[PDB]
Design a protein around this ligand. Structure first.
Ligand SMILES: CC(C)(C)C(=O)N[C@@H](C(=O)NO)c1ccc(-c2ccc(CO)cc2)cc1
Ligand SMILES: CC(C)(C)C(=O)N[C@@H](C(=O)NO)c1ccc(-c2ccc(CO)cc2)cc1
Ligand SMILES: CC(C)(C)C(=O)N[C@@H](C(=O)NO)c1ccc(-c2ccc(CO)cc2)cc1
Ligand SMILES: [Zn+2]
Ligand SMILES: [Zn+2]
Ligand SMILES: [Zn+2]
Ligand SMILES: [Zn+2]
Ligand SMILES: [Zn+2]
Ligand SMILES: [Zn+2]
Lengths: 513, 518, 518, 53
């Protein structure tokens, strides 16, 4: 653990991290729906839909072993409410034993198959009721059809949205969660997997939401060491002197103008059995992206959001928690991130500067705000030197993603069809949506520099996400490589908080392939 | 059906060149396993060297001339390399003591040439044809191409060789002298002969669309463009029908009519039909966006980079559909019925223009809140899609320069395709491969649908939040196809060739391959 | 000839003041040797002190009054300095027991006064005339000026003294009381006597142009401006001819007609001619840009700093040509034939406007690709130059508020002149020297001509890359003068006086000096 | 304007002189920047490149 430099004594020297969240104290019980629902304590919510009838009435079909609640849930009473997606009502009443109980529903629309976006709306309606309920137990009755993967996604999203981050602040949480669903026995194994997936996403959210004065290259690498020590992972933090010896000129040039020295995070998980697959996960770790001398001053550049420019690093570290906890077999995974800060100073690198990457390629810097691909270039060279089977990088790389796929779907590029298919498969099972975009080779000529080996950016082509992928491709010589651009999907602007995007996607990729 | 004018000098028709110098080129295909004759004009060998990155040139074909064969010996050819795009010219005398011109074009070191690679090879060939008053060109294929890539070679050669001089008065090229004969030597020649006339048909369909797009908006207006569609249908014996304002008011096409309210040219809906002889097995509707000029309306294109001077190309979708109508009308496929549709109008600023905030009613009854008059393409397409589905077809395919966001997603080379049917999207991709017009599948993300929820109208024309303009626009168009397989091709980024300052005619060959290979 | 209206309150003519109060001023110039009489009104001494930066004022002229001379002794005047622009007033009784007013204006320490310096002293003089109900002003020249600078003093004095009140209703004169007599004392009363009436003619020519420019676009439209040109030609017995749309269509003036397509006012081409009764030795055509309002067209003036509210001045070139027509028609030079031309129109946004990208045909057959509807001045000038050369003249001189880039090259004081003939450029510079309207010679760089190469038309209207717009526009204008000495004066930066919030009438005296001193 | 190419210099080589004949060079024009070069054997059977700008 290095020492975080300060300008004044009031500058923080570490990232506050909450490991034991109230979610971890929630006891989860799964019962089969075919045996009737017991409504005795807490809040009971029914997930109801009406196929065909667009915004049709609510109809409760499950038998409840309570006379007072059964009368409340009679058809004549429930038809006054509709099943429009997200609509909800809950009532407070006394049960047969004169105990205060809360009963209600959440509308699930008229389509039988709920998407991940639909499940988010149902969960958000559920969480709105939890943030206004001092009760000890919540029971969810699934009168809709969801598979094992979507059920786990329901629990993860519930746990994640229920949790409130109060680390920078100067209802009561439930202690029990009951779930009624058909074939309960097959869904029980997803409960503890959802809890692990929850914290990996929430841990990444804590790093992203942490402002740049709390989360800097030194404090972020310290948090990675502390996490690796708690998970018994091998760890190694490369300082400036080691990075200079490795000739990481592109990565070091970005951090020249920062008061925080560059820190390269390298965590490793090795299995006790025969290692059959080697994977390197690379995350972009810009703790703050001012843009450099290409300052983010244009309207819509959103410089106040740029604490999230380490979302890729946070996803890789969040994946390290899930992998270190679930402990897969026959796999060796490397968690890498070239962490630095892009600032304006007398020591910053300039537009037009020509720098040399660790593979010998000279790069002409056309825009200091395209610093992610510069740090990723040296990190990709480091990854391929490890001799792995797959290299997957995740980065808030290009703002053009907001104009291609938007804020819901991330884009994946790569040089290997099999790896892209595995990423797409992991996006389906993790329910973190990703779309495959092409690496158009006709645009490669626009990176031909007049003086350096290659241009950092194109001065003409506006397909920035594809051009950036073409630049990254020049630093992977003979390894299957994929690139996930999460610049559009990392931040949830409606809720004003990060999503932790990529944690579950990367973990499913390690666990399933 | 005849164009209004402001002054008598305003044009009243689009000048269209039907008989191009390409059509006067006599094309002969010979088999290489019989020797190459070097007699007149320029003879070019397409040579490659697999493996050796920029390796030496080696001519492998037998030349039926002792003098020429000696010139083309390996010891003589070793000084030249096969770098993609490189070309050389040779001067020599043949066995008959006649001066001949011989050369080559380098095809790189990869055995399989992409559409971009083949385009670079063709462009090098055209450089040798330009500023040279040759009468004959002979191409010897020492490279490996299938029937589709061979046809693509001819289409691109014909297209790039052709020069549009319809609008040149005092600055016509005094040295423009097209060749009159084209000879091709290739292995297995009998199998490639059927691609020659198909390439010539595909060339003109693309060039015809290029002629309509390149024609400025004072020449190409809704009336003059629909007049050209009638003339084209008459020459091909296609059924045609032009819907005027009175008919359009009665199909209740309020969205389409609102876009053209501010124009001096009345709206004209083009409906061409090709019916097959015999049992019809597939019914297809092709819809093209036909904005002859897009000023943006009261949402005027005044922001930096809006490029209002390019907006004559906003009927590129209509031109692609009309260019496909030529190919279908000429090649005459069987067991297919195709409808060529375009709701043609002009988006202008006037006291009669529709305003931002206006609520209009489409022909299917849906009320639309106009949030941006520059998003007029989806409004005209909405009524055209309702008209198309009413025909009872199996597939509806629309093509449009719809959203400028295509430049930030796929760029200038690949068009985007959206749709509601996996099999139909697969056919479009499948047609993109054989036509060599690249297209990439992009998603219709349903989570963004809520941003089109209007407070007062049934649906919003535009989203006020989501910046994924191509996806939101596809979500809007989807609301006007109720129960038919539908696909949507956004060509706003790929329609114009900025390096050459000319249209591409993009979509003609793709749509034709889709219709022909069904 | 009838001005169309939207409402009955729309004006149908430009109010023009020919009778100025300046014309009612009796001007007498006396020699300094005979002594100065101080009797009525205000007597002002223009004093200088070379070397001495701000040294004391010293009156050197003999004053034919014992009381006044004692007050004006050096010991009394040493308390005042000669800083440029400073002014003082004195009250005294003369020999003759009458109250008189005496003062001075400092003229600095440089012996040769600038045109800007002379304007600064004159402006200080006018401040003494304002808010003072004087009947006579007497100016005593204790400085060294040639005949041209002395005339410039009178022209500038008359111009700045005059106040335009044509559009004041409830906020009018109240206290406006012009002097009725002006006395001037100078060594050589005799050779400066002929400059008095020439200054009065030059003053009104400049003020007449200022009246047309300051007139808003609802008052000064293509119809009302040409009506005023006819009225001016009738008062001066000049030949006049106004070409309407039908005649302009027959002359194939497609570029000029396209600019005015979107206007409610029909295009009007002004053609005035002055011929001398003797043998004509030189024939000259003066062309003025006559855009009564420049909204920019669909390339709307909406960018920051575009200053659309100033664009009533876009006919400043036409106003200067008409103001020159007054001076030439009044002074009646000999052995000269002058044609006064202006292609007048209005650049508006409408369903009938021409669009960006439109290809139009000039009267010389050249097709032009419109890249920006706000570059409309060169389009109207193109047809006007073809018309001018068809008259068979020796010199063609056009003056226009053509390019805003003039503000970044020469600024608000110096106009730029371009041309294809050294002899004509030298004459323009010589007349600029004698008229004291500063002009600087700028180059027509032929290397930029390639940026006007259109892919489809004969020539591009604008360059898409080169930002030297004043030179590129000059390259465009050169393409419409084939075999005649031609010069082009860009007055876009110097036409409007922003400090005084009024036009300058720039170009009237320069063009008149050019015609008279040939 | 953009007239044909005409080589006026005497070339002391029969093969090149034949290439530079007026009938052969008239197929090229003199537009500023336009150029063509051809590869051939001279009288001594040596490879030479000849052209114009
Ligand atoms: C400079 C260039 C090539 C245009 C680029 O893509 N720059 C990157 C970058 O800074 N890389 O280091 C970039 C990354 C994210 C955003 C972004 C994301 C979301 C939001 C909120 O809507 C706002 C802005 C903008 C830009
Ligand atoms: C609503 C919104 C987002 C403004 C829009 O998408 N507008 C449409 C439109 O105006 N009609 O659909 C649009 C279509 C094409 C381009 C475009 C394409 C290529 C180039 C080449 O640089 C330049 C511009 C821009 C805009
Ligand atoms: C092609 C391009 C660059 C648009 C152009 O040159 N436009 C001409 C024009 O409109 N010609 O018709 C233009 C003429 C004058 C001014 C101008 C002059 C002084 C001031 C006072 O600050 C403000 C503006 C601006 C523009
Ligand atoms: Zn950046
Ligand atoms: Zn960044
Ligand atoms: Zn538009
Ligand atoms: Zn459009
Ligand atoms: Zn203008
Ligand atoms: Zn103008």
């Amino acid at each position: 653990a290095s020492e975080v430099p300060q300008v004044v004594s009031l500058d923080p020297t570490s990232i506050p991290i909450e490991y034991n969240t109230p979610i971890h104290d929630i006891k989860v019980q799964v019962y089969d729906i075919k045996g009737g629902c017991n409504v005795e304590e807490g809040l009971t919510i029914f997930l109801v839909n009406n196929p065909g009838k667009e915004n049709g009435p609510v109809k409760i079909s499950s038998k409840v072993n309570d006379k007072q609640v059964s009368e409340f849930l009679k058809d004549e009473n429930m038809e006054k409410f509709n099943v429009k997606l997200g609509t909800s009502k809950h009532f407070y009443m006394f049960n047969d034993n004169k105990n205060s109980v809360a009963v209600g529903y959440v509308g699930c629309g008229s389509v039988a198959d709920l998407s991940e976006a639909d499940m988010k709306r149902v969960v958000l309606s559920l969480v709105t009721m939890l943030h206004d309920n001092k009760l000890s137990k919540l029971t969810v009755v699934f009168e809709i059809n969801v598979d094992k993967n979507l059920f786990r996604f329901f629990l993860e999203t519930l746990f994640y949205e229920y949790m409130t981050d109060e680390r920078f602040k100067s209802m009561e949480y439930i202690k029990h969660l009951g779930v009624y669903i058909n074939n309960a026995d097959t869904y029980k194994e997803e409960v503890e997997k959802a809890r692990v997936y929850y914290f990996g996403t929430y841990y990444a959210s804590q790093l992203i939401a942490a402002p740049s004065n709390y989360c800097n290259p030194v404090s972020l690498s310290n948090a990675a060491v502390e996490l690796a020590q708690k998970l018994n992972l091998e760890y190694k933090i490369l300082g400036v002197k080691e990075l200079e010896e490795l000739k990481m000129g592109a990565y070091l040039s970005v951090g020249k103008g920062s008061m925080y020295p560059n820190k390269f995070i390298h965590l490793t998980y090795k299995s006790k059995g025969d290692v059959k697959k080697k994977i390197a996960l690379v995350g972009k770790g810009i703790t703050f992206d001012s843009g450099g001398y290409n300052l983010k001053a244009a309207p819509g550049s959103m410089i106040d959001l740029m604490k999230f420019d380490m979302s890729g690093c946070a996803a890789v570290l969040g994946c390290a928690y899930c992998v270190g906890t679930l402990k897969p077999e026959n796999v060796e995974i490397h968690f890498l991130s070239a962490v630095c800060e892009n600032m304006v100073s007398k020591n910053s690198y300039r537009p037009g500067d020509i720098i040399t990457a660790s593979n010998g390629k000279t790069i002409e810097v056309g825009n200091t705000d395209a610093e992610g691909r510069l740090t990723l270039a040296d990190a990709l060279v480091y990854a391929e030197k490890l001799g792995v089977d797959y290299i997957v990088d995740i980065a808030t790389l290009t703002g053009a993603m907001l104009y291609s796929l938007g804020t819901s779907y991330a884009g994946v590029f790569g040089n290997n069809e099999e790896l892209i298919n595995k990423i797409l498969q992991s996006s389906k099972t993790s329910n973190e949506p990703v779309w495959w975009l092409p690496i158009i080779n006709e645009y490669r000529a626009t990176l031909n520099s007049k003086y350096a080996d290659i241009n950092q950016i194109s001065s003409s082509v506006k397909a920035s996400s594809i051009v950036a992928s073409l630049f990254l491709k020049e630093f992977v010589q003979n390894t299957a490589w994929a690139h996930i651009d999460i610049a559009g999907v990392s931040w949830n602007f409606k809720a004003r908080k990060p999503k932790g995007f990529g944690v579950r996607l990367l973990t499913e990729f390690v666990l399933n392939d």
